[PDB]
Amino acid sequence: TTTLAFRFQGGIIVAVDSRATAGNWVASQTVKKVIEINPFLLGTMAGGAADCQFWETWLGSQCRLHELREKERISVAAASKILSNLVYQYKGAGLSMGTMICGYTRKEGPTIYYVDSDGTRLKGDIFCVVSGQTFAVLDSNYKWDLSVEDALYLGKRSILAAAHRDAYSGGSVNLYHVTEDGWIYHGNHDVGELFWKVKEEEGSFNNVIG
Amino acid sequence: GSRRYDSRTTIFSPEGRLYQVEYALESISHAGTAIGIMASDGIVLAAERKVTSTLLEQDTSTEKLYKLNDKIAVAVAGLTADAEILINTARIHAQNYLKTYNEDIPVEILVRRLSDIKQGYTQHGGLRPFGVSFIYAGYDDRYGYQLYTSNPSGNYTGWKAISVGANTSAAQTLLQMDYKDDMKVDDAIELALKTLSKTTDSSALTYDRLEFATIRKGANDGEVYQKIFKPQEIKDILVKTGIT
Amino acid sequence: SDPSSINGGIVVAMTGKDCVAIACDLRLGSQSLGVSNKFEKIFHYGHVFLGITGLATDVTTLNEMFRYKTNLYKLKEERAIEPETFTQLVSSSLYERRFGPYFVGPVVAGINSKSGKPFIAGFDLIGCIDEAKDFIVSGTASDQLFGMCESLYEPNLEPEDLFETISQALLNAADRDALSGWGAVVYIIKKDEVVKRYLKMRQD
Amino acid sequence: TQQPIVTGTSVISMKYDNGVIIAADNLGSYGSLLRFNGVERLIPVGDNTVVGISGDISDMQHIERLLKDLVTENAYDNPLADAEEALEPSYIFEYLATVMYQRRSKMNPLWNAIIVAGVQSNGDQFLRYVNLLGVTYSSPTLATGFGAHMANPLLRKVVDRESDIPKTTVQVAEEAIVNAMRVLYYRDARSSRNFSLAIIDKNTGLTFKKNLQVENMKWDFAKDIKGYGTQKI
Amino acid sequence: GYDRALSIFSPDGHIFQVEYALEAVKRGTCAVGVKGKNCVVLGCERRSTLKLQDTRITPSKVSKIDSHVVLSFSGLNADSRILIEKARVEAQSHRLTLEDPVTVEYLTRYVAGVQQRYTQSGGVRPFGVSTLIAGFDPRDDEPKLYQTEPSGIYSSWSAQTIGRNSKTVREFLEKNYDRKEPPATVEECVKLTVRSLLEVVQTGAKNIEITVVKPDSDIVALSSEEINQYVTQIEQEKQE
Amino acid sequence: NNYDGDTVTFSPTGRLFQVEYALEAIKQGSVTVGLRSNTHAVLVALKRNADELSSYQKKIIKCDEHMGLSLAGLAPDARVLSNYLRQQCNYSSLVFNRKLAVERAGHLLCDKAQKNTQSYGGRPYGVGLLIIGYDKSGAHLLEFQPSGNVTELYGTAIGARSQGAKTYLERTLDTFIKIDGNPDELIKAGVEAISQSLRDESLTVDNLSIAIVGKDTPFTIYDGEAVAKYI
Amino acid sequence: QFNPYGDNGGTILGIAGEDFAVLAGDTRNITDYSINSRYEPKVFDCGDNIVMSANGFAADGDALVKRFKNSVKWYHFDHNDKKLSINSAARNIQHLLYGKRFFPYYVHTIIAGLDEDGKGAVYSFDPVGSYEREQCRAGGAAASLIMPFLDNQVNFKNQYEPGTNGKVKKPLKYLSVEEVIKLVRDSFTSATERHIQVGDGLEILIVTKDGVRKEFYELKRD
Amino acid sequence: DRGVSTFSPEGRLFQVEYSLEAIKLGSTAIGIATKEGVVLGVEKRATSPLLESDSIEKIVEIDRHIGCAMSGLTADARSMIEHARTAAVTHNLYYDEDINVESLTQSVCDLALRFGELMSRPFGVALLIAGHDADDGYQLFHAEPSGTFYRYNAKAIGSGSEGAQAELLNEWHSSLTLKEAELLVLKILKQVMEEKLDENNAQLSCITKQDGFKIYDNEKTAELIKELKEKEAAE
Amino acid sequence: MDIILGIRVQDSVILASSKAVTRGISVLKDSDDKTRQLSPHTLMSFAGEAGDTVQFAEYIQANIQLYSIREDYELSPQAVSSFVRQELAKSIRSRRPYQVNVLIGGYDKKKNKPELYQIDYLGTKVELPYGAHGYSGFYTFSLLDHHYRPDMTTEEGLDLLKLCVQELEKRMPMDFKGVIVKIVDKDGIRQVDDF
């Protein structure tokens, strides 16, 4: 599993792979590791697929109740802390979850929170989870003053880098652009077709023959 | 069923008064007078025991003045048994605070907790309120010497001088007349006894009808001493102030 | 891992002629690391002295608990608790946590205000009372203290002689224990005066 | 969670043209000790159902009481208790299957394998299995424990599929069961010679046979077997 | 547990225990709220029947719920403490979970919600308390003033009064408070609040308490002398 | 008088006035008819509107594929008792793979209603129910009173002016019991029965509610233009 | 110790067509190396044009199907006989499964039907209620034998246009119900040859706008 | 005294009948259902001119497809609104869909009779629940403290109800446009209101399939009031 | 592992806390602030188990902020430290104990003296001139034992702290990505930008 979220001038880029494995067996190449909590909030799937889906669908329900009661869009800080407080109640029971809660509000600007099954809640500019490892991939071509088109490509290229090397990452790349007025889907890209095109056009992956 | 026999102890009258609180205050008005006077250099608690007997063991008797901790004491007006239930609760809260913070409980925090318990009995549970009014004499290092009162309603207020029980109207007028801000403990002792001596329903005020206490920084240097007066000590201060 | 030897430290109590002595080291550690040299393990509630060895969090908790309980006792009884009565309260309090005990070795020392009789007692962590005439030992160097006390101790020592005996018993026992030392305090207790002495000792 | 103490071995059963047959031996084993011999492990419920039970005997005696209580309860405020509102095999099974799965789901099972044999109101053969895991299945032949390994193969040679059931008479079905009980006596170190056999027929009703013995056994060939290889005497 | 339904409907569709609670409020000392352009002022009556009072330690009539919100009340003092405690707990609970201090409207809605609950719960009587809740929402410069009452209804007010002779001081505010131009400065707002209490109070001595709340958690209680200067200036302008 | 303050008090003549007052709520309720043959059982209910803008209050509730009732009185109480029947029917199916007998459903409704008549703090149910069903002993009609009294009948009616429909059914008894394998004719007899309980108002398309259960007929409710056939 | 779980073997296959869906399963029930039954149905009509299978531990499978069927019955009662859409059924089954998150239903669940636009739908669930909408899903013992074949013969993966040398992918064509059933039958015939837990019989439930119909085919009994 | 759940000799629950009297004293709320949407209008009835009228919230959103107007002891409505919002969201969580308006109304009405010696008394507030679902289109429901709910083509509740309902009886037809319904609510509110109707003492709202539930701006309502005045002066 | 250091100088208390957040082998953050302002003159730093650290710190903050509002008074550092200790002493015998270690640095306005309290996850409390939690204590303590003087100025304390961090950066296998330094004095709590 490779999930990437980073903050830039144009908002937030969210990039994920679509591969699910049971042992060596590839269960699916068409998993959706981005959970659309609501039209302005996105969640990433890592660890337990059920735990991530169930509690981030629940988070959307809790977010909707907040907006009815307070007649205001819920802040990313508040939405993230509902989820972090809930998993902390279950701590030691065997919930498995590593997620990036992504939203853009006028109050906060573009905001990413990393939320953990261990009860960790961290705000950061960039978060990446690769197959049981999470961190602030290549990090060489990332600058705040980056175009929306360029930032989308960087996220797409970053997932391609992991998918090639990592056995448990692959299938396709799913792209999301998060703006103040909501998120925009930037489509499903097969890693097979992407790899050959990226290789040819970038010149990269010289070691691989094609 | 049972509803038939319920007095409904926690309802408003059409005037917006609490029946059982008002009737409890009526009960307290027939209790022996207790007076608290706060001076610059300490507090005085003076209280009248209700029509006593010659066979009552006074030196081992306590109905008015109780110790809550080393810094805080209360004068009681009302049902002694009801007061003891609340006093034991207050003693436990004081020790809970000391255990938690490693600091003696500030006077108001203790007073507020006891007042909040009384309040509860007037709003839920369908039980009769506590037929008790307290004068709290205490010292802490935030506000220094403090006098408070609480009544069955669970309302509490701060005072320079105050009375509870019988003839409070008369007692408060006399205190309001002779009290000054620069007053000292020895002066306050005299005022308290003179006030009881004039308001008492008894023929004369004697040692065997009084309970007396002083909270003084008259403790060697930067500390506070509580003094629950012995029968002989009350007899001496009555002669000193020239009442007997 | 063993809760009674994480923080380390020792207490010893002795009886003399119309006097008792109670003494403790000043070390608090995290196993091999020394953290504090000012962790006194002897407390007093009126004229009754309590030493507590073992897990430092429980030493602090039980001190706060017995201050709490002796404060309420005094308010209700209108007199200071006596050593014999306090010993029963310590036992009662420890045994109520029978299946989740405080990891402590308490030691009571004091003189009965009415009889004038010197009193010492020790307890296991669940409140079993050792009421020895001679001496009580507790802590990570209890073996060493037993050794020192059993040879150094003789009955009916005068206060200023008892001071030397208990001091030499503590110091030499602590110097043969890794988790004890870093200074020591000795209380010499008489019916209506108590002297507290800090001992000079090696700081390793 | 427990462990079985006193245990009963194979229950075997099969459907025939007009009804069902079920059989089980009378032993109650205490580990390797064959402690109890007069244990009845076929418990009839009315005149249309027989419940064959293997595994823990203390749990069997509990289930026996549940079924006895079920018949009492069904008769309460029920004018048609001995007619249209009599207990069906299907009702008795579903109840036991509910209990078995609930008990496994509380991690405190009834340590048994149960076969419910009977004939329904409409004359349909009923044969279904349930065990300590709440696992259920139906087949033209059913057997528990060793029976599953040795009885099923023999019974399946008579009724291999649903279409064989109308072609199988009660005489052929009983013969196959009695032979399978002999094979289990030869080869199951926890079997007894003494067994009970129950026939539930849609015409002749419930026929319950007690104190049956395995007979026509082959042992004579044993005299000619000497040593374990090279020995000739 | 004691389950008795004390708050019930009468044939005329009234809940007498809720209406008798309002009578407790009517008996309470007068409390007034006036919001200016960039402030809210809470004025409170102190009945002068109680002298020899220690004003240092005596429970003050205006309570901070958080650093940015204040609550004043008319009615049973003891009842008010339970609502103040619950409100203070909820203010910290909101900061802990939402990572933002309560809005004035949210804190009002909570207190009002507690008051309502006590009008259709078994074995409890309604609160003999009405509240004025004033302050500024985090990072907002718009003044907020809300009122609650025993029934549990709440609403926003340009200016409002509660307690004894509140009818009189509301009469004053209704003719003296212009919505198009509210008290522009702290001075003007405090003056209008003191003026409104002087209609009812008696002596302008220790009988009037004034608390000024400004944006960004700027809350201060005026002293006797500061208020006495307003009392002096008002009557000197009146002598004409 | 002095004995009607709660359900736990007998009168000096051994009456339960709260139960009798609950019984009164049914009489105020809109008329509903129940009747059966040997093959089918039919409910017919006159639905009551608040005014001309309002809908007509639904009277018939499905309890299972083989059982359901019609209500007269407090609709929320019918909802509670029908929900309880749904659960008891459901329990019988899940645990015993067995459709709950209509007679046993009657016994359960009786016992649930009874508990509310002997305990302090509670109140009797303020609704009457006509339960129809088809089980292993054929077609059944039950009348439920919130006293706890449940009665198996060939036909009956409850609600305002129900006596008219009940007298008609008492005359027609020998005719409608013989309407076997003809659902339409049994409903006609039910519609003709409820017509004896009408005054001023007549059966319109959004006024009439009919339910039927039978041998090869699951419990199905007919409303709107589905009952225009029978008007 | 007592193990509350078991393996009853079996293999199930859900395929979504353009205007239809199939849910297929073998009819063999096993424990270890024994056959319990050669015909124990594993795929069920649940009503509202939804077919379900919970393959794995048959006890947990029967319990979940029973609970879901009951959920449909109560949805009708509570929501004026509203038809339960396949998407709503899927979300409901997630809550049934996640309810036992800390003592799971030891099953792989597949439901098949039509979406609200009348297009074929299959939903696949993990034991704890993670779910996805899919065009192809095999579950159970022989899933690893079937899915690679379906990737090749349904989605035309690794297939290209002859004479383009892998520059033009084989174009995706809409498969008829008849061609899907051929691929199902060949999948199970192949699985039966190579997996010891697969055989005896194949039962296929086909869902269309016309409703649910049933097809049965014999498999090798060894 | 007497039981809270006691029946009168007529077979009515005293406390329910008494709560209906409390609702009669409530400010007027009017609902009109059309094929283009459902309109919800309320009288605000501020007790003083210093009360900021925009803080009076008697029209409330339950979900995007369900609006709600209240009349009576409005404080009692808050827990009913809370339950309705929770029921709407909870159903969407369980079933990945919008909850039917009737099912939402039925859920609210299940609270009603949960009183005795559960809450100490019935609710002293009536609700007009307006919404849209795919199955039964645009719907208006009247939820009473009796636990009974009626569907209405048009309904008035509160002090001016019997007068307003008689007016709705004459005015409502099946072909009403949303614009016609808006003016009709404003017209009947203006008739039964003590004070003169303006954009500050009255509030409009509507639920359409496209835009969902919307509370009207004071500026928007002010234009509809001016449109009403002109069309009434037009004959 | 995390570094939390405290040194109490003449007129203030300085807290140095490692900025790194690492789960297993990957570094989640390099700017983490392991501190909570309990009151205007009381600061708490914390290190320990993921989730527990922030949950415990925020819970203490909420309780001290509640007490501040209710009494319109600031609890003394001694009082705050005793409250924190008791909460930790409760949690060890609880179902799932808080694995959090804290340093409490506060300025006592009544006594006009700075105070530093060290409390471990068991509720073991000591008042020290300087303290640390974890492996960092071993390296740092011996250095502070030599250089520490009770009459040190804030600038001298920062220099001694700066020396400690440099030493830890060399001898520590882990990269803790530097420290954040906060000073607690009579004027309140401020962050040292330069370090």
Q: Which of I39, I86, I126 to substitute to test the interface with B, most B CBs within 10 Å?
A: I86
**Residues D180, D167: Cα–Cα separation, whole Å:** 20
* Type of residue at C164: E
Phi/psi for E236 (5° steps) reads -70, -35
Element (H, E) at H83: helix H77-95
**Residue with tokens 């499905």, as numbered in its chain:** F62
Quick check: D155 and D143 in contact, CB under 8 A?
yes
**Residue D136, Cβ density class (10 Å: 0-12 exposed, 13-18 middle, ≥19 buried):** buried
Name, in order, each residue with C-beta under 8 angstroms of E215's C-beta and a sequence gap of 6 or more. Answer: E38, E136, E140, E141
Q: How is residue F29 annotated by DSSP?
A: S
Q: Which domain CATH number covers D49?
A: 3.60.20.10
**Residues D6, D26: Cα–Cα separation, whole Å:** 12
**Which three-class secondary structure string do you get for I85-116?**
HHHHHHHHCCCCCCCEEEEEEEEECCCCEEEE
Tokens at A182, concatenated: 């909501």
Interface of I with A (CB under 8 A): 21, 23-30, 32, 49-52, 54-55, 96
Quick check: C38 and C27 in contact, CB under 8 A?
no
Residues of E in Cβ contact (< 8 Å) with I69: 64-67, 88, 91-92
Residues of D in Cβ contact (< 8 Å) with G31: 135
| Nearest-CA distance I22 → chain A (Å) | 8
Catalytic annotation, residues of D: 1
Of G126, G134, G144, the CB nearest to A49: G126
Count Cβ neighbours within 10 Å for each residue of C151-190 and write b for 16 or more, e otherwise. Answer: ebbeeebebeebbebbbebbbbbbeebbbbbbbbbbbbbe
**Residues F5, F3: Cα–Cα separation, whole Å:** 6
Residues of I in Cβ contact (< 8 Å) with A135: 26-28
Q: Which domain CATH number covers G34?
A: 3.60.20.10
- Inform me whether the C-beta atom of residue B95 falls under 8 Å from chain C C-beta atoms: yes
Quick check: H208 and H36 in contact, CB under 8 A?
yes
- What's the CATH number for F1-231? 3.60.20.10
Quick check: I122 and C57 in contact, CB under 8 A?
yes
CA G81 from centroid of its chain's CA atoms = 26
SS3 of residue F13 by DSSP: coil
Quick check: E53 and B157 in contact, CB under 8 A?
yes
Q: How many domains does chain B have?
A: 1
Domain ranges of chain F: 1-231
CB contact under 8 A, I27 and A135: yes
Distances (CA, A) of G76 to C130, H88, H103, I93: 75, 17, 11, 50
- Inform me whether the C-beta atom of residue F126 falls under 8 Å from chain H C-beta atoms: yes
For each of the domains in chain I, give its residue range(s) and CATH number, in order of start.
1-195 (3.60.20.10)
Q: Give the total residue count for chain C.
A: 204
**Residues B92, B97: Cα–Cα separation, whole Å:** 9
**Residue with tokens 């199988």, as numbered in its chain:** D168
Quick check: I176 and I3 in contact, CB under 8 A?
yes
Tokens at H25, concatenated: 């004293």
Phi/psi for C68 (5° steps) reads -50, -55
| Nearest-CA distance G98 → chain A (Å) | 8
**Residues B173, B182: Cα–Cα separation, whole Å:** 19
CB contact under 8 A, B2 and F120: yes
CB contact under 8 A, E96 and I59: yes
Tokens at B179, concatenated: 């009290």
Q: Which of D132, D136, D163 to substitute to test the interface with G, most G CBs within 10 Å?
A: D136
| Nearest-CA distance F87 → chain G (Å) | 10
Which residues in chain A precede a discontinuity of more than 2.5 Å between C and N?
Answer: 136
What proportions of chain E, in percent to the nearest 5, are helix, strand and coil? 35, 20, 40
Q: How many domains does chain G have?
A: 1
Tokens at D25, concatenated: 């031996």
- Inform me whether the C-beta atom of residue B6 falls under 8 Å from chain F C-beta atoms: no
Name, in order, each residue with C-beta under 8 angstroms of B119's C-beta and a sequence gap of 6 or more. Answer: B153, B154, E78, E79, E81, E82
Per DSSP (E only), the strands in chain C are 10-16, 19-25, 28-30, 33-36, 42-45, 48-54, 104-111, 118-123, 129-130, 135-139, 184-190, 193-199
Tokens at G10, concatenated: 């079996």
**Residues C166, C14: Cα–Cα separation, whole Å:** 7
SS3 of residue F110 by DSSP: helix
* Domain span including residue G117: 1-222
CB contact under 8 A, I29 and A91: no
Q: Are strands D205-213 and D194-201 parallel, antiparallel or unpaired?
A: antiparallel
Topology of E1-240 in CATH?
A: Glutamine Phosphoribosylpyrophosphate, subunit 1, domain 1 (3.60.20)
**Residues F219, F211: Cα–Cα separation, whole Å:** 7
| Nominal resolution (angstroms) | 2.6
Per DSSP (E only), the strands in chain F are 32-36, 40-46, 60-64, 67-73, 127-135, 138-144, 150-152, 155-158, 208-214, 217-222
| Nearest-CA distance F199 → chain H (Å) | 22
Residues of A in Cβ contact (< 8 Å) with E140: none
- Closest by CA position to I159, among listed I16, I50, I4, I3: I16
Q: How many domains does chain D have?
A: 1
Element (H, E) at H43: strand H38-43
* Type of residue at C45: Y
**Residue with tokens 């309140």, as numbered in its chain:** I188
**Residues C23, D157: Cα–Cα separation, whole Å:** 91
Element (H, E) at D155: helix D146-155
Sign of the Cα torsion A43, A45, A46, A48 reads positive
Quick check: C104 and C59 in contact, CB under 8 A?
yes
Domain ranges of chain E: 1-240
Element (H, E) at C39: none
SS3 of residue A70 by DSSP: helix
* Domain span including residue H206: 1-235
- What's the count of helices (H) and strands (E) in chain D, helices before strands? 4, 13
**Residue with tokens 């209620």, as numbered in its chain:** G129
Domain ranges of chain C: 1-204
CA B230 from centroid of its chain's CA atoms = 18
- Closest by CA position to F146, among listed F72, F209, F60: F72
**Residues F211, F206: Cα–Cα separation, whole Å:** 14
CA triple G35-G38-G43, angle to 5 deg: 115
Phi/psi for F10 (5° steps) reads -75, 145
Residue G81: closest CA among chain H residues belongs to which residue?
A: H135
In Å, the largest CA–CA distance within chain F is 54
- Closest by CA position to E107, among listed E141, E55, E77, E69: E69
Residues of E in Cβ contact (< 8 Å) with H125: none
* Type of residue at B160: K
Per DSSP (E only), the strands in chain I are 4-8, 13-18, 21-23, 26-29, 35-39, 42-48, 100-108, 113-119, 125-127, 130-133, 179-185, 188-192
Tokens at B163, concatenated: 């009375």
Distances (CA, A) of A92 to A59, A115, I58: 21, 16, 20
Quick check: C138 and C132 in contact, CB under 8 A?
no
Q: Which of C65, C72, C74, C79 to substitute to test the interface with B, most B CBs within 10 Å?
A: C72
CA triple E70-E75-E81, angle to 5 deg: 50
Residue G126: closest CA among chain A residues belongs to which residue?
A: A50
Beta-bridge partners for F141: F132
Instruction: Give one DSSP letter per residue of G76-130, joined into a string.
Output: HHHTTT----HHHHHHHHHHHHHTTTTS---EEEEEEEE-TTS-EEEEEE-TTS-
Residues of F in Cβ contact (< 8 Å) with D98: 94-95
Residue B4: closest CA among chain E residues belongs to which residue?
A: E4
Which pairs with CB-CB distance under 8 Å and at least 24 residues apart come from D125-128? D125/D15, D125/D16, D125/D19, D125/D20, D125/D165, D126/D20, D126/D49, D126/D88, D126/D89, D126/D90, D126/D93, D127/D13, D127/D14, D127/D15, D127/D20, D128/D93, D128/D97
Angle between the N-to-C axes of helices D170-187 and D146-155, in degrees from 0 to 180, rounded to the nearest 10: 140
**Residue with tokens 């919002």, as numbered in its chain:** H85
**Residues D16, G23: Cα–Cα separation, whole Å:** 33
C1-204: which CATH number, 3.90.1150.10, 3.40.50.970, 3.40.50.1820, 3.60.20.10? 3.60.20.10
- Closest by CA position to A130, among listed A175, A160, A94: A160
Residue E84: closest CA among chain I residues belongs to which residue?
A: I70
